[PDB]
Amino acid sequence: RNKYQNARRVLNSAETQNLPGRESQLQELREFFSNHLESQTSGSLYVSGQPGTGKTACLSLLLRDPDFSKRLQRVYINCTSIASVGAVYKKLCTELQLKVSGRTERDHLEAIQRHLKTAKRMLLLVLDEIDQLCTSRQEVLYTIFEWPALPGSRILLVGIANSLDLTDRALMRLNARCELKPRLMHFPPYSKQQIVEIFKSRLAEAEVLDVFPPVTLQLLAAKVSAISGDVRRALDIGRRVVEIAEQQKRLKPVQVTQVAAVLNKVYFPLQQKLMLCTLVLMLRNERNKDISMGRLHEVYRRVCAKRNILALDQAEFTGTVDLVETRGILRIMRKKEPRLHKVLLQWDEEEVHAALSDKQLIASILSDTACL
Amino acid sequence: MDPTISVSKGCFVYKNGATRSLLGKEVVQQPFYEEYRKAWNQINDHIADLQHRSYA
Amino acid sequence: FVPESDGYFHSAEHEGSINAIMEEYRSYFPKWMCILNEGFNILLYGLGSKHQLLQSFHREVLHKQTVLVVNGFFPSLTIKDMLDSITSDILDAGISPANPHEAVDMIEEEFALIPETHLFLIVHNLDGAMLRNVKAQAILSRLARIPNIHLLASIDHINTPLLWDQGKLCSFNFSWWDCTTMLPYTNETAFENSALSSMRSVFSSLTTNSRGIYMLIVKYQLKNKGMPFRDLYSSCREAFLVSSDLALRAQLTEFLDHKLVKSKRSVDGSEQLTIPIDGALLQQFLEEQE
Amino acid sequence: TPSQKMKKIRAGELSPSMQQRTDLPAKDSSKSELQLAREQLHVSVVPKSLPCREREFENIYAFLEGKIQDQCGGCMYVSGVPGTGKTATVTGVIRTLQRMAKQNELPAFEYLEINGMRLTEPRQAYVQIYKQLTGKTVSWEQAHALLEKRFTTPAPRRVTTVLLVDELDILCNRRQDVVYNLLDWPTKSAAKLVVVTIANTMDLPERLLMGKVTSRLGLTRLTFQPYSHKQLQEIVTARLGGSETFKGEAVQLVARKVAAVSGDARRALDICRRATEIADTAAVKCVTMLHVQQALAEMIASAKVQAIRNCSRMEQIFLQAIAAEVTRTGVEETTFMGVYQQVETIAAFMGVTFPPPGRALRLCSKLGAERLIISEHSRNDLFQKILLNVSADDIHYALRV
DNA sequence: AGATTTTATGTTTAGATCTTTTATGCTTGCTTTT
DNA sequence: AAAAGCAAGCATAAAAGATCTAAACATAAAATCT
Ligand SMILES: Nc1ncnc2c1ncn2[C@@H]1O[C@H](COP(=O)(O)OP(=O)(O)OP(=O)(O)O)[C@@H](O)[C@H]1O
Ligand SMILES: Nc1ncnc2c1ncn2[C@@H]1O[C@H](COP(=O)(O)OP(=O)(O)OP(=O)(O)O)[C@@H](O)[C@H]1O
Ligand SMILES: [Mg+2]
Ligand SMILES: [Mg+2]
Structure with a gap:
């Protein structure tokens, strides 16, 4: 119908006849x-x-x-x-x-x-x-x-x-x-100006050039050609800007705020919080980063005992650590037995502290050296 | 290079009608091949007879 | 050749001469036909390449007999490939059984069924790259035992008869022949069995953020004369060269694929990131990037 | 002959019927109100409109409606921890789109669906997608060839087809050919495929998919966050209707102690059903808070101290001596020989004699079958290694208090 | 309208692969007797 | 002082241990011959 759906259709990411970059x-x-x-x-x-x-x-x-x-x-x-x-x-x-x-x-x-x-x-x-x-x-x-x-x-x-x-x-x-x-x-991977020329070809085949001002195209290509340089992610973020602006506004050219927001976007349960705080504590206090699930659970039980809140059993703690693993915060190297599985942190603690968003609790757990 | 020198195959059949006495008739009909075959058959049969009579 | 043990305990005209040598070895051929007729197998043990000599024997003399050439200098041949070749193409018997000695038993039965269907078997380098195990030599000796199958073979390695025991050396009824051609080992060594410029050629294909990550490892290496992973992660998050940890791990996996970076894990669990190039060339590379 | 039955099955011409009950199911009006809450609280009863998933509904609905009306095709990747309303929201969006296409407010579309854990092999998805099209069962090679003939070749009037794919991580394997085909078919102009992929891990395209497969999967994505303290209460109070059979503090305690663990909604809808079954046997008609506390203690069970207290006395001496050898040698893995020496010390203290080591291996085998300890096969006696599976303080808590 | 290879397919077992972990060995760097 | 001798250190590699996969084997659908 309108220019928004026209640009969203024409960015396409399918087969094409004209190839300005190559x-x-x-x-x-x-x-x-x-x-x-x-x-x-x-x-x-x-x-x-x-x-x-x-x-x-x-x-x-x-x-x-x-x-x-x-x-x-x-x-x-x-x-x-x-x-x-x-x-x-x-x-x-x-x-x-x-x-x-x-x-x-x-x-x-x-x-x-x-x-x-x-x-x-x-x-x-x-x-x-x-x-x-x-x-x-x-x-x-x-x-x-x-x-x-x-x-x-x-x-x-x-x-x-x-x-x-x-x-x-x-x-x-x-x-x-x-x-x-x-x-x-x-x-070779596409440069910034080649991605701008691909966008200016695709938006002029359907005459929907006006929905994208050149400044925000030169922001988008400057991010994408610096990150990876593939035109598929470039056309994907270019389609996503229009399909988010259609959801948000319901001709307005897209501003730099929308493309900057989608680019910064693209580019907890309490027991999971206690598990992440005990893992950060054991990784900070100890030179040996070979943490087993049992060695972590034995500290987690003492931390829950000093917090005066009920602790999970090992059979539920294994599922809790497996649910934390899906976020990418951890990686579990499997072994022969569930107690012997090796947790490995995959975020730095400066990211884990900003992810937990409960600084009054992490200040209590990380100052609790005696429970290790 | 040579057709036998291939980057992929390691064995090269040159089959000529194999289904499922190397010398020509000039050599086999020569007398020296006859006397050699006669002396060799005599010597080999005598040695096999000695080995059987020792094993018996 | 009678070696002394103290060395262990203290440890143009050439083309015409080679052509005369090759013409003499070409003149040897009818004697080899009679020797192969009597049941002996031919073995050549000269210095240079004997590929062209056995090819000339296959071309000039065995032009009509059944012949299975086997390239033993091939890195990737298997004894299953040769037994499958005999069983499928010579006898039309389909695929050979998966046990190789069962395949030799089958070949012995089917060749017992057909007298005067001789199979010549030319093996350049019987000491080949995949024939150096004892089992393939036992299969080749059991094949050379057959009255129908005649065998010509080349030998190049000095330590070849260490794998022939007296049973194989009795099955291999060899007639040794000193065919010392002086030809270079072109084809035998052409196969797979026997750098700042490449780093620049792969660095040119990288995107800008990958160039920044590798320049961070180069600056840390020249500054410290392998970096821990956490310093590279904090430097990339400060320089906005990466979105999260997993993209940096993907970039270092790409660098491991293109061998710019060696990853050496520490006993503490931290990952070390050495660059396997001397620091003078690395300093020249950093000067090239400026 | 059986072959006619198998041919009628593989051609799809006989529907796979299941046996019906001899007796009729009971009428709805005979049910008690507590039974009505027990059957409204079943996890299989999906609501017609899901509480607390309106934003994700608008997101998937806007994506699928734009991909259907533009007739272009594409792909999406939704992800989140189990029980967070992923597949229910995606099928609710697709049922809403089918209700709208039935009234000709939207272009019509086909709806294929697969699941990666219902397939024995990743390639069997080719058998199943074709089975949602023609209904014939064929080999995966012929099915893949017919699917390529359907999607690569422009054949008007081609209709838009939405291929929901649950359980994307099972379809991966090493070659990743199946997921490459499923994400490469939309990119062709002739195919109007709009594939949606549901999975658990947020980081799946970067963690285990190849770089070209991740490039085809795109940057449009949605994450289902775990249910909070309040959304789990809204879900259960929507399931109960206007009934007051549950106390509000009871639902609040169920939601507060389930959201602190996982954020799963199935755990709350199962704990409320168990609380209804507990209130039923007390002959009360309201699920008071101690019934919820009993159901919570039952379904977040921690029965290892009961196992150590229920062990025979020689097994308790064995469980003390394993922790004693762990404290003595420092390392967590103990051989059976030093465990038996500490066993003889503790048995000399308590005054009972201990069984000879061939019976102590039977005790170790019983504790290793009960998984109170980890232990090797008994063929290498006195040198087998004995990990302690229960925590060392749990043994003293069982055998003292 | 029924028997026979023929062929297409599914299963199973041996082999390729990924990964950890452990070790002898290849080399180094002193070290020390003749 | 010269060259054989003991700790050190990274490294190919070797076991291994699970794990996934490719080809050999058993088997069923089916054209084909009678
Ligand atoms: N130079 C170009 N100009 C305009 N569009 C392009 C250009 N290059 C690529 N595209 C668009 O990008 C899409 C993907 O490109 P293509 O599939 O050829 O990349 P690829 O290298 O084959 O990816 P892969 O390596 O993953 O197979 C194409 O459908 C095309 O529409
Ligand atoms: N927001 C909600 N409102 C009402 N009921 C819900 C809600 N979320 C989940 N449920 C109930 O919980 C069940 C969750 O099933 P669903 O298929 O959504 O899980 P899922 O996220 O797909 O799990 P998995 O990721 O393991 O496949 C549904 O049957 C539904 O009855
Ligand atoms: Mg699901
Ligand atoms: Mg391509």
Whole structure:
């Protein structure tokens, strides 16, 4: 309906046609595909980078080009979708409609090699999320990357991954032969101005540019590009600003107060309070931070006795510490017996004191050295 | 490099009709192969006979 | 070679010469065919690589016989892979049984059923990276015992016959042959079995807050000539480089993945964060970041 | 033949019926007022409108109504400690949206739901989501392929589909393929999926999900805080209606002693039912405060001092000597040999003889089966290690006072 | 309208993995007899 | 003074111990041959 719901729809975070931030990367990928088409030679490639930087958007944009539709046979395989690491050849056969004698992965591999030896068109095999193909012996990944070096094969394959060094660390054996190792392409995380240009593209495709003044866009991109640089979190906070402003106001451009509030937002039971205070006391008073559940409960019972309030039994105390564990304040390393489980504090005490919000009690527990 | 040198496989079948006397006829019909096979069969059978008669 | 124990108790023209050596070893081949016909197996024990020599024997002489080449210098081959290769491709008998000696019993039965179907077996580096256990050598000796199967093999390691006892060395009916080519070990050492620049290349890909966290560890390391985790946590919360503890643990997990930082736990439970690079190069790196 | 039954089950053509009672259920008018409170206080009776969860209702309702009307799809992650009204609020929002779509005030939408603890395997969710669509039971590979054919391919008129996913941490595993598929399907434009994920831990996407899975899960999130002293009283007094069968101080004591422990609402609705059952056997018709005190002492039980007082005299000598060896050697883990020597000392003091060590191992095995102590298998006698599971002061409190 | 491989599927057990923890061993740094 | 000898210290690694997973094995649905 209105501009708020229009901007909330258009921020989308789905597939797109225009990619303002990735232009030199698209030109480099087009030059790679074009020179390996004109030379009619095979060529492996490994694109990588942090999640949300837009690798799959670039390759989905380049698998819809009409001229590459004329010149080469596109195949896109998402490697999470296969049932197993060795099953991917079978999926590749279904992407090529190859006839197979069937029901073993070896004959599917021989059918793929027999297709590659006498293919009429160049093959572009994009294997999205190739980190799922890594195992231990890694027969499948080496068998896939050995295909460009096969005699007469015309495959040129692209492997998308989040790891900067998956190619070297996971495929050291391809370094020995320079014809085999993939050309590497990083996708750097988005800068501040690139996120501003992505926002100014998405809000001008629907002409809802006016709901975001430039100052608050340059606050939002300055936070997101400094934290992580993925455009998914940027579009998520940009959608969340409008869907909070719609809930709050019911054209008003969003002010810096709303984006600052959602950015500072994004970026107790009494027995749980007594447990956290006794854990802070035992961690402060003692050099040995190997605290067991029983060693903590024996101090917690004395603290509850000196406070003249009833203490929980060990069977309920274990569930209390497990409920405190869900907040992230603690981490319990499990052992053979419930008494032997090791509590480990994961907040500093300056955060625990501000989280408990009962300073008159923590001043009493932390001054109670004699109950340890 | 060589097709036998692969990054993935470790064993390389070169099957030629195996289902489920290496020398040609020039060597087997040579007299020296005949006398060698005769002397070897005689010596091996005599040694096997001695081993059986000692174990009996 | 008669070594003295006191060393333990006190502890161009070359191409033509190598081609003449290779032509002599190529001239040896019919004698190897007769020796393999008599039941002996061939073993080569020269200095240099013998890959091209056994490939020439497979190419020029065994051009029509059934042949299973086995690359023993492969880091990742298994004896199950070789027994599965014989059982599935030579005999069409399907997958071999999971016990390898049961697979050798099956191969002995199926090869007893077919006389004059000889299987040549070429093993470059019988002392291979995954064949150095006693069990794989027992499987190879039980396979070489078969009258149908003939075996050629290469040897490179000096300590190879320590795993051949007299039973294996009797099953391996070896005819030793000094095939000393002088070729370099290219293919045998090409595999996986045998830095400030990389730190800059991974530092370029990091975001601004990760650059600030690593610069904090670099400043503490150059200031102290491994930092406890609590000082890095308080410095990041003061510099607003992190939202909470768990994001800092995720950043240090990424640094452990990219090997910029080694984590050494203390007896007190605190986590120490060493940077595994000498301090002169670290001071040059800090000067590079300014 | 059984195969026709299994084929009619896997095709969904026979509904799984359960056997009905021979006798009719009793009429509502024969019930006592205390029985009426006992059945209104059952945890299974969800109220039509939940007290003290209005803000979270507006949050989930605004998110789901915007995702349905915009026809875009997306994802949400709600989280909180158990019993805090998560799944009841999400199903209440979805029932309100279905009541609104029935009257054509909203676009219509499908409502799939799964739960991660009803699945034996993480991949079996593919079997179940398809079972909420077609109703056929198929293998997980064919179900995953048919779900990808449904979601990746634009097929107008596609309707919006809301996939509630309870118990998200069980679906994880090491590969995290299932949760990656469930969070990756909304990102495609062809699928109008709006997946909501319920879980307990606040920090789950950062603690155990992968970085791309956390990036797909997004930054829209909601946390259900534990019920306080007052909200637990409002819940129980809403469940009781206008009835005065509960004293107000009794509900106040139930809420005050339940909110101090966990903030679970099921604990309050169970303690009030036990208080009603306690008041029923006293032949009173009002749940006075001492019935609540008895039900609280029963359901927050601490019966280990009773176990040490109920032990046989040689087991009490054993429980004294284990704590004596812990005080003597300092370390908390004692071998059976020094425990037996302290046993002989204490038995020489008290004047009774002690059983020989082959019977003392039977005493140690009984205390280790009762979990008063932790102890090893008895095959390594005299060198087995004996942790004390009960606290050392509880033994003196049992055997003195 | 009934028997036979054929194939797709589920279970189980052996092996890969994560993690803690413990130890001999590889090297160091003095240390001390000939 | 030279080179063999005892505490010290981090480190690969070795047990282990739970734990999760991949492939081998038993088994059921089903086209296929009669
Ligand atoms: N340069 C860009 N301009 C506009 N939108 C973009 C750009 N890059 C990415 N996006 C948006 O971000 C969304 C996610 O990008 P994409 O899925 O390609 O990242 P990714 O690297 O594949 O993530 P992951 O590594 O987790 O798979 C896309 O749907 C797209 O709409
Ligand atoms: N605010 C409330 N008002 C009334 N009843 C409530 C409220 N919160 C919880 N309950 C009761 O307690 C029960 C809680 O069930 P619910 O499914 O909400 O728990 P949950 O938070 O999903 O638990 P888990 O996280 O363990 O799945 C409901 O059946 C409901 O009857
Ligand atoms: Mg992607
Ligand atoms: Mg629930």
